[PDB]
Amino acid sequence: TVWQPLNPGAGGQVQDVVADPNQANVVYMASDMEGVYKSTNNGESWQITGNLVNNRVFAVAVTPGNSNKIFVGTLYGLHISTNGSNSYALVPETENKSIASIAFKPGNANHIIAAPGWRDDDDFIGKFGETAAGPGQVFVSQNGGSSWQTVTFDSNSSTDRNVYSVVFDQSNANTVYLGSNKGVYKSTNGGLNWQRIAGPDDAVRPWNKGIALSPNGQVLYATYAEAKPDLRYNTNFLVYATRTSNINWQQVTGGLEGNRRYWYPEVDPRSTGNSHKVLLGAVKDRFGLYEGTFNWDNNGNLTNFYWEKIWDSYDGSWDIGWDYATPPNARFAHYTPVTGGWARGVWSTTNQTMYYASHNSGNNSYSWQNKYSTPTSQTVNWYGTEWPTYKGKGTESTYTYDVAVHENYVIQGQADNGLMESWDGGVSWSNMQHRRGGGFNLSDVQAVDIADAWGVPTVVAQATSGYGGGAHNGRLWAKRLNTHSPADQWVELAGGPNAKAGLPKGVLRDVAVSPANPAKVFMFSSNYGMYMVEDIGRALDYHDRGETLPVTQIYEGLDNSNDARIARKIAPHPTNEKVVFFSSTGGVQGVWRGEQQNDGSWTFAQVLASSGWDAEVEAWAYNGTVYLMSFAKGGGPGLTDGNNWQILLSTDEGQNWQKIFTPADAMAVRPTSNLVWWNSVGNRFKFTGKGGSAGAGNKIVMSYYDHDYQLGYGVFLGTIQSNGQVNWQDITDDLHFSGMTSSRFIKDAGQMYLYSTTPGAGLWRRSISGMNMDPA
Amino acid sequence: TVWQPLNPGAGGQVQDVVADPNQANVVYMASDMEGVYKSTNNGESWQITGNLVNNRVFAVAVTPGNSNKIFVGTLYGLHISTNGSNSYALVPETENKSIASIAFKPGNANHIIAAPGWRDDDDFIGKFGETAAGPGQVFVSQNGGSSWQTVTFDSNSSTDRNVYSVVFDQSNANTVYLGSNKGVYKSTNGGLNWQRIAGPDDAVRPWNKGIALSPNGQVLYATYAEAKPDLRYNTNFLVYATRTSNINWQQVTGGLEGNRRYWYPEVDPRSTGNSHKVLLGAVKDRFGLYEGTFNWDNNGNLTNFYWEKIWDSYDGSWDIGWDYATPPNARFAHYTPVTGGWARGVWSTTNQTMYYASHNSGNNSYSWQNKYSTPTSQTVNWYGTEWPTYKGKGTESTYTYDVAVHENYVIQGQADNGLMESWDGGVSWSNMQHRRGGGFNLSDVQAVDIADAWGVPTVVAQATSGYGGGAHNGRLWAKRLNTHSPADQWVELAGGPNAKAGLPKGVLRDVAVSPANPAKVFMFSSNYGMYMVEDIGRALDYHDRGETLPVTQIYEGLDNSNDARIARKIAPHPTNEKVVFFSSTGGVQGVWRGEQQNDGSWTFAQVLASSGWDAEVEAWAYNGTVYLMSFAKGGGPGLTDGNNWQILLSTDEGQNWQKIFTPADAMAVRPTSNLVWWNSVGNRFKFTGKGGSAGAGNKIVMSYYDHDYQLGYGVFLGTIQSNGQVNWQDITDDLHFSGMTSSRFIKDAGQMYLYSTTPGAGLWRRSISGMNMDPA
Numbered sequence A, B: 001t002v003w004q005p006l007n008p009g010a011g012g013q014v015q016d017v018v019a020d021p022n023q024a025n026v027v028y029m030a031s032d033m034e035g036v037y038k039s040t041n042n043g044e045s046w047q048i049t050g051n052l053v054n055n056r057v058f059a060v061a062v063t064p065g066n067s068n069k070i071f072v073g074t075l076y077g078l079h080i081s082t083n084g085s086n087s088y089a090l091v092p093e094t095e096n097k098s099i100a101s102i103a104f105k106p107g108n109a110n111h112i113i114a115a116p117g118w119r120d121d122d123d124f125i126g127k128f129g130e131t132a133a134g135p136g137q138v139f140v141s142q143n144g145g146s147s148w149q150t151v152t153f154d155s156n157s158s159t160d161r162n163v164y165s166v167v168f169d170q171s172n173a174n175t176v177y178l179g180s181n182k183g184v185y186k187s188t189n190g191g192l193n194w195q196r197i198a199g200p201d202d203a204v205r206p207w208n209k210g211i212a213l214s215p216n217g218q219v220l221y222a223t224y225a226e227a228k229p230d231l232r233y234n235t236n237f238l239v240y241a242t243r244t245s246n247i248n249w250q251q252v253t254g255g256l257e258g259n260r261r262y263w264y265p266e267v268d269p270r271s272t273g274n275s276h277k278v279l280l281g282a283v284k285d286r287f288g289l290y291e292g293t294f295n296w297d298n299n300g301n302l303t304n305f306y307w308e309k310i311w312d313s314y315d316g317s318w319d320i321g322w323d324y325a326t327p328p329n330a331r332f333a334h335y336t337p338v339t340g341g342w343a344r345g346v347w348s349t350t351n352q353t354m355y356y357a358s359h360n361s362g363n364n365s366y367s368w369q370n371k372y373s374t375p376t377s378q379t380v381n382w383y384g385t386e387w388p389t390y391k392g393k394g395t396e397s398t399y400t401y402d403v404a405v406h407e408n409y410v411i412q413g414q415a416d417n418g419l420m421e422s423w424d425g426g427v428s429w430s431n432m433q434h435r436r437g438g439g440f441n442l443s444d445v446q447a448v449d450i451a452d453a454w455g456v457p458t459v460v461a462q463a464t465s466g467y468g469g470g471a472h473n474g475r476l477w478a479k480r481l482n483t484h485s486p487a488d489q490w491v492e493l494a495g496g497p498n499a500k501a502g503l504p505k506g507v508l509r510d511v512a513v514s515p516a517n518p519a520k521v522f523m524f525s526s527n528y529g530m531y532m533v534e535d536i537g538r539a540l541d542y543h544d545r546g547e548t549l550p551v552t553q554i555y556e557g558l559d560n561s562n563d564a565r566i567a568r569k570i571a572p573h574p575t576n577e578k579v580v581f582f583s584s585t586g587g588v589q590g591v592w593r594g595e596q597q598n599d600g601s602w603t604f605a606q607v608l609a610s611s612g613w614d615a616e617v618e619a620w621a622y623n624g625t626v627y628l629m630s631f632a633k634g635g636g637p638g639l640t641d642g643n644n645w646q647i648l649l650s651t652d653e654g655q656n657w658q659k660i661f662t663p664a665d666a667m668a669v670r671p672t673s674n675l676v677w678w679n680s681v682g683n684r685f686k687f688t689g690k691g692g693s694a695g696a697g698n699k700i701v702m703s704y705y706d707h708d709y710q711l712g713y714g715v716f717l718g719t720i721q722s723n724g725q726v727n728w729q730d731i732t733d734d735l736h737f738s739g740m741t742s743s744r745f746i747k748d749a750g751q752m753y754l755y756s757t758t759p760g761a762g763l764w765r766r767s768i769s770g771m772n773m774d775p776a
C-alpha cells in the first residue's frame, strides 16, 4: 500500500449491488467512476477489483455455478473475468456498446443474454459516439461467453433502444422477456427471435421502464412511461400486471404514492406459487422502498394486492450514515438469491450509498444496515441532535474539488456533498454542517484554504448550493478553528444570492490566502473580476456586530477581447503580498500577473499565453529562487504543441519560461504497457488534466487525465536538481483513479505528504521522500 | 417631496408586470391598492404614475408603436393615458365595468380588445354593484381607443362572465380567441362576432382559466376547471392542447404536480415553428413556475412534451428578499417581447413581489433577480441563518395597522406580513422573526406600543396568526430593546390559543401604554372586556422563570345592551394613570371613560354617544389643558350629522364636546377639484375613515377615507390657537394613498414628525412645522 485514502465512504451515485448466487455474503458494487468493488462479508468492508477499460459500470453478473467467471457491463461494453474479478478483458463483440443487463438461462449457465443499455445515464451515452436512438438489439452467447451473437428485435434506427431488464421464465427456461423503451418483447427460443408485447396504453405511455416475471412464468409486472427526452421531466410511471397466457394489462398502483418514477420491478425468487412479492423503487424520487404482495387465484384473477413501504424516511430505526439523504431514493433494489446459502434480504441504496436489510419472516419485518460507512465515537451537533463522524468501509466515489489541512482538521470541498469535514486527520468525517437553516444546502465547495483571523487559523471556502457541479453563485464562508472540533461553526462573509459585501454572484473558482500575509485572501468571481479581503479578522469583526465589511475589487474582468474573465487557480506570491498570479480560463486566457502599487492600485498583465479550462499556476520559494509553474495548453511560439498540456516553469516571475514536461516525457517515464485501456481507447486519449499540479520545495507533481473518458494516464513527481534540471518519476503506484483536481504538499506529524483530490474517488495522500523545504 | 415613505418594498398581492414592447427595460406593475408603477430600468427602481379613478388595477397594455399611449384596466373600468402614464382619463364606455385584459391586433395597433374581468378577485367584483354573473362581452375599438363597441359573445345573464385572456393569431391577425368561465370562444373577424369552442369535458370542467396560442396559430393551449363559486375550494385545473384546425383536446399534465390551479398559459412569441415554449403558473398554489416544451410534427401530431420547473423552492440560487415566500406562487408570468430590443426573459412573482429572470440560451438556464427590495449590509439571525435587512425599490403595498418608534427602532404592524421591524429608523426592514417555531406565523399585528420593563424600553404588540386580516386571537407579545438591534427577541406574555395569563381569545384591537406610568399596559379583548398589565417588568420576571403572571381584568363587556364589547383605540390619560378612555365599536358604542378607585376597583361609563367601526379617541396634555378628541360618527343631539364622521373635542374629559371639523370644512379647505375621481364616483363617497387621527401639543390630524372604494379625500392638520379655535390646513400634498389606519406625532432627531400608517400603502412620515410640546 502506497496511496492512502482519507474518505467517509461512497458518496457517489451507485448503479447496483449484485449478490453472488453461489456463495452467501459475496457481493459486487457497480460504481459509475471507479469500476467494481467486491466484498466477501456482505458489505462490512469493500475491496477494489481489477482494472476495466471503462469505469462507468451499469451491470455485474456472476456465473451460476462458477464464482470465478464474472461479467461486467460498462459504458464501453462488456468485460469478462475468469479469475473472480482479479483481472478483466474487454469482450470484442460489445466494444463501444454500453451494456446494462446480463442474464443467464435457468439451468444452463452457458446461455447468456447481455443487453445494450445505460440505466438513467442518458447524459453519458454519447461519450464514445453512441446514441440513444438505434435498432433494438441484444447479445446472446450459448458457450459461456467465448462468442456472442447480435440479435435484433426492432429495426427502427430513430427510436430509443435502452433496455432496462432481461428476465427468464424459471419454469420454462426457453421463454425470456425484455423491458425496453422500445417496448416489452418476448422470446420462446432463448432470445434468438423476439416478438413485441403491446403495452397497456401505447398511444400515451409506450416506454417500458423495467419488467418482472413470477417464477412460475404466469404473471408479468411492468411500469410504463410517456415518451420524453429527459427523465428529469418525466415524473409519472404507472405500474401494471398481466397474465402472460393472454396479454390484458391492469393498473395496480392502488396504495403507491402518485406521480413517481417507479422502475425496475422484481419478483422474489421465493414466490414460486400464486402469491408474488414485488420489489419496487424508482429513479430520482425519494420515498423509500416498496414491497408489493399480489395474490392470484388459479383462475388467473388477481384476488387482491397491496403495497407496503419496507423502507421509509429517517425515523431512528436505521443508521443513515454521514449522507443525510432522506427519504431514500431506492434507485436499485434486489432480493437475495435462494442459492449459495443466502438468507432472505434486500440490497438497496439511499442514492449514493449501500444498504442491506435482513428479514424476519415471523413478523415480516426488515432491519436496515449501513453498508457504506462506519460510525466512530466522535459526535457532531446539528439540528439539536448528536451525529457520529463516519469512516469509509472501503469505497470512495465523491467528486472532490479541493482540500485543506490544519493540525487535526481536514476539509475536502466536494460537489453534491459540500463541506466534508474531519477532526481526526481525515479518518472520519461529517458534512452535516452544510445543511443550513432556511432550506438551502452548501452542496458545492470548489475551493478551500486556511487564513489567519487575529492569530486564529480560519478556514475559508467557496461554498454554495447546486448539485452535479452546477454551482449557483460565488459565496465566501469562514470557520474560525477555535477548538479544531465540531463545535467550530461556519459564517458567511461575502457573495451569495444577496451580493453580500459587494461580492458579485460569479462563482469563485478558487480562493487563495497570501502566504506572506495569511490574513489577506484573494478570489476571482467568474465573469466579474478579482477581489480581495484585505484582512479577514476585520471582516469577522464587522460580521460579529451584525454588519458587513465590503470586499476590495483589485481587477475588473468584463471585456472578452482584452480582460481575463475567469480564473481556475490563484497563486499569491510566496513572500511579496503585493504580487499575485492566476490562470485565466475565460476571455484572454493564460497566466496573468498582478502587482499592487504604493497608492494601492493594481496593474495586471498576461505573462504566458496559455489556455485550458482547468489550467493551473503555482508560485513558491525554495533556496532563494521563486518558482512559477504552469500546467496548461499552449504557451506561444516555441512552447505550444497542439492541444497537449505541458508543465512550463519560470524562475523570473513569468518573463521567461522553459518546457520541463510533455506527453512524450510522460510516456517514456510511464510506458503505455501500464494501461489496460491503451489498445482499445488510447487513440481517443488526450493529454489534458482536471488540475492536480503543485510545487513546493524541490518537488513538483502533475497528473495527466482526460475527463471525457474518465481515463488517467499517471501521476508524475519531479525533483528539482542542484543545477536546475528536473528529474521525473512515476508515482502512480497503486492509485487506480489517478486524475486529480488538486494537489498540495503538506507536512503532517513531521513527515511530508502529497494530498491529492480526485474528480470521482475522493481524497488520497502519499508519503514523499527526500524533500527539502524552506523553513516557514 | 413632502411625504417620506419608510417601507421594505411591495408586500401586497401583485396583479401583473407588463413590458413595454417598444423599449427594453420599461415595465409597468399593476397593484391592487395604489394603481400603476412604472420603471425604466427593468425594475431596479419604481416610480408612481398618474392618478386613476380606481386603484385596483388588473391589466396594463402599452400601444405597439406608441409608448405614450397606455391603457389601464381597473375595477371601475378602462383608463387611457396619452402622455406615457403621467395622467389618466376614464374611458366612458367601460365606466363601472371591471377590465382585466387588453390586446392589440397584430400589425394594427388601432384595433384593440378590452375584456371584462377581475382575475381572482371575486371578493371585490361587487364593490361598485357589478356581479360575476352576466352576459359574456368584450369591448372592441378600431380607431385606437377613441371609441369602443360592445360585442356580446354569450347572452346567459346567470352564468359567470369573467374573461381571463384574449389572444390573437400572429399568422392571421383577424383570428382571435378568448378564454372565459363562459368557455373558450373564437372570432375570425377581429372580435366582432364570436363562436364557442367546446372544451375537453364540458359536463365536468366547463370553465376555462386562460388560453395560449402558438404564433403560427396552429395549436391552442388551455386549462379547464370544474364550476365552483370560490377559487379557495377549486384546486384541480387540468392542462390541455388541441390543434386549431380540428378541435380535439388532449390532456398534457404529465410531469406537472397534481391538483394545482394552473392558469394563464402563454406561448413564447419566439416559438414561431413547431416547438412551443409554454409558461405556466397558478393562482394561490406555491410550486414555483413551469416552462413546457411541446414538439409537434408537420402532421399535427404531438411527438412529445415535457414540463420543467424554471423556478422552484428557495435553495440559495436567488435572493428571496424580505418576504420569505417559498415556494413562489407565480400568480402571473410573462415572456419578454421580441420587439424594442428586449432580451429573452421572464417576469413573475412569489405572490406579493416582483421578479425577473434572465435567460442563458447556451444551457437553457434562468437567473432570478429580486426586483422589489434591496439588501443592506445589516443582518438578522433566524433559522440559524443570517438574512439581510431590505429597503424598498419604490413600491409599498402593505396593509399596515399601527406603528411604534424608539430611538433607531421602528415596527409597523401589518396584515399578512406581521412584525415588520427596522433598526435604521425605517429605511430597511426584516419580518423574519414573525415565523415562529412550531409552524405558526405572527402574520397579523394590529397594535404596537413602547412600554418600560424596569427601565428597559420594551415593545408590546398584539401579534397573532391569520392572513387577509383574519386575526385568530388576542395575543400579547413583548420585545425588550436591550440592544436596539436584531439580537432582541419576542416573548409571549398573554392570550393566544392557550389563554395564557388568563387573557381571553378576543382580538386586542388596540394595546396602549400609560404615559403616566409606562410600565402599565391596557388592552381590550373583543367581546370580553378591558384588561391591564399592571407592571410589565413583573410580568417578564415570571416569564423568565418559565411561569406566568395573570393579567388584571378591569372592565367586563359581555352585555350587548349595556356594556362596551369591542374597542378600536385606547387612550390612557396623559398624567393620571387611574383614568383611561376608549372608543367602543361594539355593544354600546361611543367614547367610554373609566376611573380607578382607591380599593383598585374601576367604574366605566359612556361620555360620548358616538359610533363607527374604526372610531378613535385620543387624550393628551398641552399647556395646562387635557384635550380629549374623538373621530367618529354621531355624538348625540346637536352633534350627530347623519353618517358623516366628524372631529369632536373636549377639554373637560368628555363631559362637554365641541364640533371642530366636518365634511363641509374639509371640502372648503380642500376643494373637490383636487380629486380626479369626484366627477365619476363622488356620489358614492362617504366621509368616514379607517382611523389615522391623532393629537399632540397644539396639533391635530385626521384623514377622510372610504374603504368601500379605496378613496381618500385628504389629510387635514389642525393648529390649536391661543384662544381655543383650531385652524385647519390641507397636508395631503404628495401623499397619493392618503387613507390612514393610525397616526402618531413623533420627534426624531430634534424634529417633530407625523408618522402615519395606511390601509394599503405602508408607512409614511411628514415634517410638521411650528409645533409646541409640553416637556416630557
Ligand SMILES: [Cl-]
Residues within 6 Å of the ligand: A251, A252, A253, A254
Ligand atoms: Cl390501481
Ligand SMILES: [Cl-]
Residues within 6 Å of the ligand: B251, B252, B253, B254
Ligand atoms: Cl398527460
Ligand SMILES: [Zn+2]
Residues within 6 Å of the ligand: A013, A032, A120, A121
Ligand atoms: Zn448515472
Ligand SMILES: [Zn+2]
Residues within 6 Å of the ligand: A402, A446, A447, A448, A510, A511, A742
Ligand atoms: Zn484551491
Ligand SMILES: [Zn+2]
Residues within 6 Å of the ligand: B013, B032, B120, B121
Ligand atoms: Zn386580488
Ligand SMILES: [Zn+2]
Residues within 6 Å of the ligand: B402, B446, B447, B448, B510, B511, B742
Ligand atoms: Zn394602536
